[PDB]
Short mmCIF file of N, CA and C in Angstrom, two decimals:
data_model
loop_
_atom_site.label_atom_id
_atom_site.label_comp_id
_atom_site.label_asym_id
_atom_site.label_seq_id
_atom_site.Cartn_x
_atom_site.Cartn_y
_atom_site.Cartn_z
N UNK A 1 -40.18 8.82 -3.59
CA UNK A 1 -40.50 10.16 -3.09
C UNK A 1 -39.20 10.92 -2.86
N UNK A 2 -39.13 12.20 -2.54
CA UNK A 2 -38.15 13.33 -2.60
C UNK A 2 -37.78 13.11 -1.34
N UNK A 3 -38.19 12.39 -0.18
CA UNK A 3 -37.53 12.39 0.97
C UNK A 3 -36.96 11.29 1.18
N UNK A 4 -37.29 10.13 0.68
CA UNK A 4 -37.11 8.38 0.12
C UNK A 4 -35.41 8.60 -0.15
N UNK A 5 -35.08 9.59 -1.15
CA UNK A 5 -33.87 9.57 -1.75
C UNK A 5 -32.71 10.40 -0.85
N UNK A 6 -33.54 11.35 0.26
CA UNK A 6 -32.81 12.36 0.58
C UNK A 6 -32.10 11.63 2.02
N UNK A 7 -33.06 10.49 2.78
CA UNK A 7 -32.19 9.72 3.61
C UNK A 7 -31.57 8.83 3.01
N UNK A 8 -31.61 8.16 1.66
CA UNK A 8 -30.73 7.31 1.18
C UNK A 8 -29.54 7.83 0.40
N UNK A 9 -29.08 9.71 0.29
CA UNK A 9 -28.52 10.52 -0.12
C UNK A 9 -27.50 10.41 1.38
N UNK A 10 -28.03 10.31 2.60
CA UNK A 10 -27.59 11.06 3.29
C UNK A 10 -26.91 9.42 3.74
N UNK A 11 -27.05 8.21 3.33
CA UNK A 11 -26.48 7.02 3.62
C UNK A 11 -25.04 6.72 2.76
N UNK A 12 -25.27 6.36 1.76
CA UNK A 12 -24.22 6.81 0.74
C UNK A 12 -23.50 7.33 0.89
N UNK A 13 -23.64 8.91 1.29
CA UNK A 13 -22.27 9.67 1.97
C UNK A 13 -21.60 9.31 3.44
N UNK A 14 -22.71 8.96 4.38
CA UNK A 14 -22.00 8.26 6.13
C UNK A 14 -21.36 7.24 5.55
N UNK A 15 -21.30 6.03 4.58
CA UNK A 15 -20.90 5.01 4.26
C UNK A 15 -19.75 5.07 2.85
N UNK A 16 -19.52 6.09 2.43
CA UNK A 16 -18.81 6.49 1.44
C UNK A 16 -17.22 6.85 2.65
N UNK A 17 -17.61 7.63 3.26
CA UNK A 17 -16.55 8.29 4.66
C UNK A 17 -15.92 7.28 5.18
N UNK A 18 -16.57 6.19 5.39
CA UNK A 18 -15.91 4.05 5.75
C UNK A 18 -15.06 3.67 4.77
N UNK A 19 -16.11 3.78 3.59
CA UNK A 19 -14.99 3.04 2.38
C UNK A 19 -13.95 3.78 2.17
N UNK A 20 -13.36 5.28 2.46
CA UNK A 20 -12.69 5.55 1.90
C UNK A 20 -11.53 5.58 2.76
N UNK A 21 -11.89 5.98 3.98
CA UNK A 21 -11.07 5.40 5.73
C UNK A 21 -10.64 4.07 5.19
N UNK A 22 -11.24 2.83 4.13
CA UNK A 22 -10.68 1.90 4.50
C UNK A 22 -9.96 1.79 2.87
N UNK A 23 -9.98 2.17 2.12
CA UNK A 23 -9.15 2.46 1.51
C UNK A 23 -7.93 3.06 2.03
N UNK A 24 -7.29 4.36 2.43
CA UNK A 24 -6.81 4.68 3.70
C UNK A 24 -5.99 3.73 4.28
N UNK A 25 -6.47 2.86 4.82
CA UNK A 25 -6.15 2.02 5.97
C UNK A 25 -5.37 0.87 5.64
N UNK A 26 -5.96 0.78 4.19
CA UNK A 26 -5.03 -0.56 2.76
C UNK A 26 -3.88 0.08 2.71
N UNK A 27 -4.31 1.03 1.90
CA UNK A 27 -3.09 1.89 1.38
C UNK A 27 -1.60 1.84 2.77
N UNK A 28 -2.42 2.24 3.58
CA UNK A 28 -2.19 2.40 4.84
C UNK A 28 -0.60 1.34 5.07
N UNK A 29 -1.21 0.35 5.48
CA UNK A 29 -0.80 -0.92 5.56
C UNK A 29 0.00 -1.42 4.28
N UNK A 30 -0.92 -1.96 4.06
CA UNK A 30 -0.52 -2.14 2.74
C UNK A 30 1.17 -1.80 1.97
N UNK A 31 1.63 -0.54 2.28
CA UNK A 31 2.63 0.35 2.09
C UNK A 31 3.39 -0.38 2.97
N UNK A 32 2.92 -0.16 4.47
CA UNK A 32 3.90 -0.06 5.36
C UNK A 32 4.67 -1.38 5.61
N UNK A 33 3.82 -3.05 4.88
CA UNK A 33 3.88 -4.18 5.37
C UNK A 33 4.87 -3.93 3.88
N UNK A 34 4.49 -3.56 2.48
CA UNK A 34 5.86 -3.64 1.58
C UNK A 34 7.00 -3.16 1.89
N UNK A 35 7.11 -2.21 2.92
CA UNK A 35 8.33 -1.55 2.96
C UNK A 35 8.90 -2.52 3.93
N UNK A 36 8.49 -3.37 4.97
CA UNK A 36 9.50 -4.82 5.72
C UNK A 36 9.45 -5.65 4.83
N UNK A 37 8.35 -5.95 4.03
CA UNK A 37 8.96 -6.87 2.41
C UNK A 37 10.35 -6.58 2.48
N UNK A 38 10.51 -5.66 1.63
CA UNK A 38 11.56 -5.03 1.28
C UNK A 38 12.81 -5.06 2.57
N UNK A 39 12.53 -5.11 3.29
CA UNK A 39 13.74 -5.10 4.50
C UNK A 39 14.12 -6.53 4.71
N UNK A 40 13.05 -7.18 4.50
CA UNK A 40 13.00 -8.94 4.60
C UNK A 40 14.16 -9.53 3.29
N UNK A 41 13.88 -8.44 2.01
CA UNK A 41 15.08 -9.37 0.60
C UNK A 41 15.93 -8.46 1.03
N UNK A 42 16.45 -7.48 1.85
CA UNK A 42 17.75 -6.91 1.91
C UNK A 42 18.57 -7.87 3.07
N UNK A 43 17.91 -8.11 4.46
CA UNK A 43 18.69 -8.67 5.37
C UNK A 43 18.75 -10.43 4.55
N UNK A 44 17.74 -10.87 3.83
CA UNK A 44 18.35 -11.75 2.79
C UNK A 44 19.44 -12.17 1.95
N UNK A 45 19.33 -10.99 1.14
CA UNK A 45 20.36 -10.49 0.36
C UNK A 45 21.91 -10.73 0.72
N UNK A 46 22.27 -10.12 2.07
CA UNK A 46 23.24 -9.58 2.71
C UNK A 46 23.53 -10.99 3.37
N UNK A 47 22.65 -11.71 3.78
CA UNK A 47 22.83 -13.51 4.71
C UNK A 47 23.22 -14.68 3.45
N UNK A 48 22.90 -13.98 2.02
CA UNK A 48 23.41 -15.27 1.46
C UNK A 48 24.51 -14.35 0.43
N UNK A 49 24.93 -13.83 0.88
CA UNK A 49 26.51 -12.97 0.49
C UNK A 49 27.47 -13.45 1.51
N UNK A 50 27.17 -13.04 2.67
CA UNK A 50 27.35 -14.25 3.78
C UNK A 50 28.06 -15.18 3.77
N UNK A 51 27.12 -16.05 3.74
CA UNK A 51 26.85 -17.17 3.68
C UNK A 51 27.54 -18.04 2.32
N UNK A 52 28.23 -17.51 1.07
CA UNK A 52 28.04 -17.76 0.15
C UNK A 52 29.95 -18.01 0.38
N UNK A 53 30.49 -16.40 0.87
CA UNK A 53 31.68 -16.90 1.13
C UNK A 53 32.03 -17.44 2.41
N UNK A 54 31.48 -18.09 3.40
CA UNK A 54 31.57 -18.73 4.26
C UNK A 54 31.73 -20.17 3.57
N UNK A 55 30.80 -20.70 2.53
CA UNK A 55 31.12 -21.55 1.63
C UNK A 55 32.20 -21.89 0.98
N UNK A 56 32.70 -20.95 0.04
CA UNK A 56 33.47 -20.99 -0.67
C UNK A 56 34.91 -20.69 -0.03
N UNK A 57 34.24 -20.50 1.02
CA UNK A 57 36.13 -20.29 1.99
C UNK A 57 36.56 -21.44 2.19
N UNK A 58 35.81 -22.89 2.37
CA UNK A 58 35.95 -23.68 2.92
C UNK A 58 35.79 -24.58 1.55
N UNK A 59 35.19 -24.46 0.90
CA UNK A 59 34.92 -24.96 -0.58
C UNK A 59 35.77 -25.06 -1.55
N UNK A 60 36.10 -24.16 -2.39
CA UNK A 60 37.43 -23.96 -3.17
C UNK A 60 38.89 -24.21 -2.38
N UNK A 61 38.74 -24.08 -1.09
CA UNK A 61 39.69 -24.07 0.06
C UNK A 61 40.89 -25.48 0.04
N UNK A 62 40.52 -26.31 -0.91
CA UNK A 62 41.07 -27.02 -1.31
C UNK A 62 41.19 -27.75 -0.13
N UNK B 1 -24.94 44.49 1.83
CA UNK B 1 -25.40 43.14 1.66
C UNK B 1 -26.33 42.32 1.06
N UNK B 2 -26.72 43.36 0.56
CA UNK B 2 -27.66 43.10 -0.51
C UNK B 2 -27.59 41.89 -1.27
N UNK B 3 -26.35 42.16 -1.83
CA UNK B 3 -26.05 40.76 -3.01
C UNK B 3 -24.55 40.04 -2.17
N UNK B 4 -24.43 40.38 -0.80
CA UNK B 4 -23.28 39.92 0.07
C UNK B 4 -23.70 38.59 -0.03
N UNK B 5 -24.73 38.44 0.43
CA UNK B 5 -25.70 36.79 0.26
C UNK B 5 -25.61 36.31 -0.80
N UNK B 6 -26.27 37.00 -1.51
CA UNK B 6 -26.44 36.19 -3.29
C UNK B 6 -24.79 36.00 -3.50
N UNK B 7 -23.93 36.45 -3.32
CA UNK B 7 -22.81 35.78 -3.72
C UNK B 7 -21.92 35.26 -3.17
N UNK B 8 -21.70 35.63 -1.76
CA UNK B 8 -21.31 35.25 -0.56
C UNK B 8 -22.37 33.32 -0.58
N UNK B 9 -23.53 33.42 -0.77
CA UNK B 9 -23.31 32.18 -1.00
C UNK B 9 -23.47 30.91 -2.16
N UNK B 10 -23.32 31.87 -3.64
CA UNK B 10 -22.99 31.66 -5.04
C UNK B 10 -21.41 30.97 -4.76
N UNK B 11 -20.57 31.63 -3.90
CA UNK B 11 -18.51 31.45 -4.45
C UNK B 11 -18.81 30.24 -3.47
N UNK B 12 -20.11 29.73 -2.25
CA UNK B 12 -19.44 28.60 -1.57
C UNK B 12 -20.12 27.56 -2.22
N UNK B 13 -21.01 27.44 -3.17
CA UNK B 13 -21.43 26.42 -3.88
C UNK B 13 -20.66 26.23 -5.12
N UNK B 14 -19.86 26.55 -5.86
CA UNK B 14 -19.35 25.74 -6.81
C UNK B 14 -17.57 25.37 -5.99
N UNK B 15 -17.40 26.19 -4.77
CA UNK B 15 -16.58 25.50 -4.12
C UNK B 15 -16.59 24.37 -3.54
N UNK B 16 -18.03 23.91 -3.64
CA UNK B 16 -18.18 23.01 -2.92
C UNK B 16 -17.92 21.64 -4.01
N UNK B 17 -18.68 21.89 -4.79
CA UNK B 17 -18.65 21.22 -6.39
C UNK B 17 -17.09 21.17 -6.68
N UNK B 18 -15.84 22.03 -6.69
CA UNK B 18 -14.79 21.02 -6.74
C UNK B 18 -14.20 20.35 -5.31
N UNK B 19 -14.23 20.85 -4.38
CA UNK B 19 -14.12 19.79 -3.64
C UNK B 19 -14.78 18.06 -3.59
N UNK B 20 -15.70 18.01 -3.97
CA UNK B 20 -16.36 16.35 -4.59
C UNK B 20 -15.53 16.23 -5.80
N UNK B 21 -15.41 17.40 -6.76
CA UNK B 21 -14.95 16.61 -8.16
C UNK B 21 -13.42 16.03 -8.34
N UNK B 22 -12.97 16.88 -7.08
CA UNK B 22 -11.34 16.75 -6.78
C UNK B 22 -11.54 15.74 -5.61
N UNK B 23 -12.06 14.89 -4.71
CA UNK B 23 -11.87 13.85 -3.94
C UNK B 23 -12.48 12.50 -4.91
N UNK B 24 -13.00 12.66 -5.84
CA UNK B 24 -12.74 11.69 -6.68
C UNK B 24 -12.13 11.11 -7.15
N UNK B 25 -11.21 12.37 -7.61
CA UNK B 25 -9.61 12.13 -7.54
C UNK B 25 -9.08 11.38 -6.97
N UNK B 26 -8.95 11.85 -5.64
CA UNK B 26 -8.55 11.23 -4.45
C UNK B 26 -8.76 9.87 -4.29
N UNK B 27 -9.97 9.62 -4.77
CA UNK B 27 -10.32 8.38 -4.12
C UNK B 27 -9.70 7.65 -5.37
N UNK B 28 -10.04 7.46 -6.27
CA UNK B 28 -8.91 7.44 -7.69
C UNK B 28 -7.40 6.96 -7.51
N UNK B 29 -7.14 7.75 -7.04
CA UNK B 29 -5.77 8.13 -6.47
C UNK B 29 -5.70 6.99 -5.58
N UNK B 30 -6.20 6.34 -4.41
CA UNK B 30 -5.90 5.84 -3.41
C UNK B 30 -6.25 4.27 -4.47
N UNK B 31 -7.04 4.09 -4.91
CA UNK B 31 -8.00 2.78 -5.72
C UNK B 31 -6.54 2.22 -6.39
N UNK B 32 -5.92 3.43 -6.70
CA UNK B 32 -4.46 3.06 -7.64
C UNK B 32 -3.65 2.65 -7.19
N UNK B 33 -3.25 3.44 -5.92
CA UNK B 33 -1.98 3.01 -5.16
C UNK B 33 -2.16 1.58 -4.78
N UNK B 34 -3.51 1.92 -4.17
CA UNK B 34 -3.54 0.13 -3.22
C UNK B 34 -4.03 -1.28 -4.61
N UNK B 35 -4.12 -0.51 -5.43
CA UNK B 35 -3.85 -1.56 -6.93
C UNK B 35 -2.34 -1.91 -6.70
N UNK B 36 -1.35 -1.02 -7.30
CA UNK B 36 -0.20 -1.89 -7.32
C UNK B 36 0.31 -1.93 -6.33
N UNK B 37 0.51 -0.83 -4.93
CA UNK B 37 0.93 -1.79 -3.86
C UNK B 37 1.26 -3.10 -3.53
N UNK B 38 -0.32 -3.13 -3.28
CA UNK B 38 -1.14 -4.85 -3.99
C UNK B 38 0.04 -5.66 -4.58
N UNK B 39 -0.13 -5.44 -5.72
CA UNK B 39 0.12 -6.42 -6.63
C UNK B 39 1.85 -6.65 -7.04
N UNK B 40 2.72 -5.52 -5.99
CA UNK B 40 3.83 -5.27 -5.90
C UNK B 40 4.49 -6.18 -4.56
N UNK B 41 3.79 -5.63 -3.74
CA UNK B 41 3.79 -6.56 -2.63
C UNK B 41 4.04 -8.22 -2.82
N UNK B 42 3.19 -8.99 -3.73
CA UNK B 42 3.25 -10.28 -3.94
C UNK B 42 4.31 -10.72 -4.67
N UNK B 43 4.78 -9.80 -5.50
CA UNK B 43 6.01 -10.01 -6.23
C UNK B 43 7.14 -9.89 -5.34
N UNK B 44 7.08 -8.61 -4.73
CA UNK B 44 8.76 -8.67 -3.34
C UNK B 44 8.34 -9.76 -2.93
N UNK B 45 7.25 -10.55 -2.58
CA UNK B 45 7.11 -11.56 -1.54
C UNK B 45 8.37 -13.01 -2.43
N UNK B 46 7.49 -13.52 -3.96
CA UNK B 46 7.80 -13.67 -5.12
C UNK B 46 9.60 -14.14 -5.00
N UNK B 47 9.95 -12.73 -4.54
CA UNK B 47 11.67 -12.05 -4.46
C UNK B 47 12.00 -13.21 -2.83
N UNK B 48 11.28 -13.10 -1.63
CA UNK B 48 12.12 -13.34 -0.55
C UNK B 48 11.71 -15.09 -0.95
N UNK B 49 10.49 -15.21 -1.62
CA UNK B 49 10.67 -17.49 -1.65
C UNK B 49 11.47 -17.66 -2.57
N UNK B 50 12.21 -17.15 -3.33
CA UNK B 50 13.30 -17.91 -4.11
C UNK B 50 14.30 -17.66 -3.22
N UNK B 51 14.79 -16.40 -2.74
CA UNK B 51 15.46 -16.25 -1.79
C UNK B 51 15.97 -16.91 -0.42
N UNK B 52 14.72 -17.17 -0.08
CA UNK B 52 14.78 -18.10 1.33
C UNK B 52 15.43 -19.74 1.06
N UNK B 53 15.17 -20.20 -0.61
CA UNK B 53 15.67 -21.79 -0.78
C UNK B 53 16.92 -21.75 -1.58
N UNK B 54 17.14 -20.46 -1.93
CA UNK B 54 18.94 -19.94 -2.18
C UNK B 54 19.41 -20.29 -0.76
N UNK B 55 19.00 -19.98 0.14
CA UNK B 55 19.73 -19.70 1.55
C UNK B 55 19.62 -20.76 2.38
N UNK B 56 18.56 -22.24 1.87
CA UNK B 56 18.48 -22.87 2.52
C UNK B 56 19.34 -24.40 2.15
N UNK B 57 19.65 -23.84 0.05
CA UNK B 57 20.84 -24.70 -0.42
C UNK B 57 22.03 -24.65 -0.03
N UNK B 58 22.24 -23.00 0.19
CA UNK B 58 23.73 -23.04 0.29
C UNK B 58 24.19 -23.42 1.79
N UNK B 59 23.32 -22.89 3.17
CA UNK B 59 23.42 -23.32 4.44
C UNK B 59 23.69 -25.19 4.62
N UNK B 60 23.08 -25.94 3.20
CA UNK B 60 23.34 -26.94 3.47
C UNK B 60 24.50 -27.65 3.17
N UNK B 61 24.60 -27.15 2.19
CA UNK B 61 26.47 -26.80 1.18
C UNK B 61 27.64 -26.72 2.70
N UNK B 62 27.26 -25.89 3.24
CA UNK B 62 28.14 -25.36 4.46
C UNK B 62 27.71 -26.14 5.77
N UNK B 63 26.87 -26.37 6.47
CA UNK B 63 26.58 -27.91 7.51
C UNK B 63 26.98 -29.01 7.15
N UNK B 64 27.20 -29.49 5.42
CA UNK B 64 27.29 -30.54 4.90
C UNK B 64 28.79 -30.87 5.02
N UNK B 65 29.73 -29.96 5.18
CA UNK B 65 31.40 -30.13 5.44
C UNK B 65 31.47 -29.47 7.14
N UNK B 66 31.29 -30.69 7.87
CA UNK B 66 31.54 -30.66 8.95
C UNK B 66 32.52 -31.63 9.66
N UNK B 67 32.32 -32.98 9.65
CA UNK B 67 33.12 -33.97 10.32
C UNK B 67 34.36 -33.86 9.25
N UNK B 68 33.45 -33.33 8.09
CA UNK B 68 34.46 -33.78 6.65
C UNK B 68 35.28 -32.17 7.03
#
């Protein structure tokens, strides 16, 4: 019936407004947890540069 | 006002029609980002575990010349 569809019209969209908040909310995140990724291989990066001639000072050091 | 109505509310119905056809977009748009985000994310991750057993050879390289 024409009214059958018009509350299941009107569900779809209250529940469309969730999924897309939680899309949103991925994205969201999602982003924000790659960008300390990213801070996580730089202070990496920089500890076994470090670390590498702390080695080799003492290493080649004869 | 005659036709103030008839068109006054003619210009807010196909405005309305791109607003849905353009948050499709949107949603498009977001379906994408959090695709490779995603799938970017696991790779930096990928980046810090080789990283972390670089750092956990060479730390041993360097504890390992101690008494010596």
């Amino acid at each position: 019936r024409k009214i059958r569809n018009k509350q299941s019209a009107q569900d779809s969209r209250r529940r469309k407004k969730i999924y897309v908040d939680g899309l949103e909310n991925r994205v969201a995140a999602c982003t924000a947890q790659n960008h300390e990724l990213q801070k996580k291989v730089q202070l990496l990066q920089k500890q076994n540069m470090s670390l590498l001639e702390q080695l080799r000072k003492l290493q080649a050091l004869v």
